[PDB]
Paper text:
The cation diffusion facilitator (CDF) protein family, a conserved family of transmembrane transporters found in all domains of life, ensures divalent transition metal cation homeostasis at the cellular level. Most CDF family members also have a relatively large cytoplasmic C-terminal domain ([name]), which adopts a metallochaperone-like fold and has been suggested to have a regulatory role in the transport mechanism. In the model strain [name] MSR-1 and related MTB, this behavior is based on the formation of magnetosomes, unique sub-cellular organelles that are composed of nanometer-sized crystals of the magnetic mineral magnetite (Fe3O4) surrounded by a lipid bilayer membrane. It was recently proposed that the magnetosome membrane-associated protein [name] is a CDF protein that acts as a magnetosome-directed iron transporter, as its deletion or single point mutations within its [name] abolished magnetite biomineralization.
However, a large number of the MSAs showed that L349 in ZnT-10 is homologous to M250 in [name]. M250 of [name] is found at a similar position in the center of the β-sheet as L349 in ZnT-10 and both residues have similar properties. Crystallization trials of 6xHis-tagged [name] [name] [name] produced a crystal that diffracted to 1.79 Å resolution. The crystal structure shows high similarity to [name] [name] WT protein (PDB code: 3W5X5) with an RMSD score of 0.21 Å (316 atoms involved, for further details see Supplementary Fig. S2), indicating that the leucine maintains the structure of the WT [name] [name]. The free energy difference following the [name] substitution was found to be 1.6 Kcal mol−1. Calculated running averages at the productive stage indicate that WT and [name] systems stabilized after 3 to 5 ns of simulations. First, we analyzed [name] [name] WT and [name], which both yielded SAXS Kratky plots similar to a folded lysozyme plot, which was previously used as a globular-protein control. [name] [name] WT and [name] spectra are very similar and show high content of α-helices, in agreement with their crystal structures. Accordingly, all the in vitro experiments with [name] [name] M250P showed that the proline substitution causes severe structural changes while the [name] mutant preserved the WT [name] structure.
Author numbering:
A (entry chain A), B (entry chain A): 212 to 291
């Protein structure tokens, strides 16, 4: 599938960002030629809530920078 | 509405739990006579991710303990 290549690129890009302890969940869909995606990342339980927010914002920048067709990306965090 | 009384009870119960800095979002719906609800609470940005998780679990217990018709409640947290 065209989509599985894209999903591989999101996961790979997310996992390279400092503080990411793996991708817990990824759901991606096409809206025309654009991708909209929902991503959940793992983070250190001892990080602050503010740190987990910064890591999500860094994941969003890194993913959207690498995958140009992404036009909406939501990133949240869970302790792992 | 029957629902607005219930929504008032969820918000009130959530806000009385230690570490809750207000209810950011509440969406509740009936599935037959049962309530299913999605709640977002505010928390101190300097709490740990583990602390924010404990506060959500305490909100879930407190809300479900006070409002017997709730059969599904999801609680997440945001810095505020």
């Amino acid at each position: 599938s065209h989509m599985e290549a894209v999903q591989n690129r999101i996961v790979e890009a997310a996992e390279r960002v400092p503080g990411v302890r793996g991708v817990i969940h990824l759901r991606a869909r096409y809206v025309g030629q654009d991708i909209w995606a929902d991503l959940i990342i793992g983070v250190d339980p001892e990080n602050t809530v503010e740190q987990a927010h910064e890591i999500c914002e860094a994941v969003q920048a890194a993913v959207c920078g690498k995958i140009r067709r992404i036009e909406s990306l939501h990133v949240s965090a869970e302790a792992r």
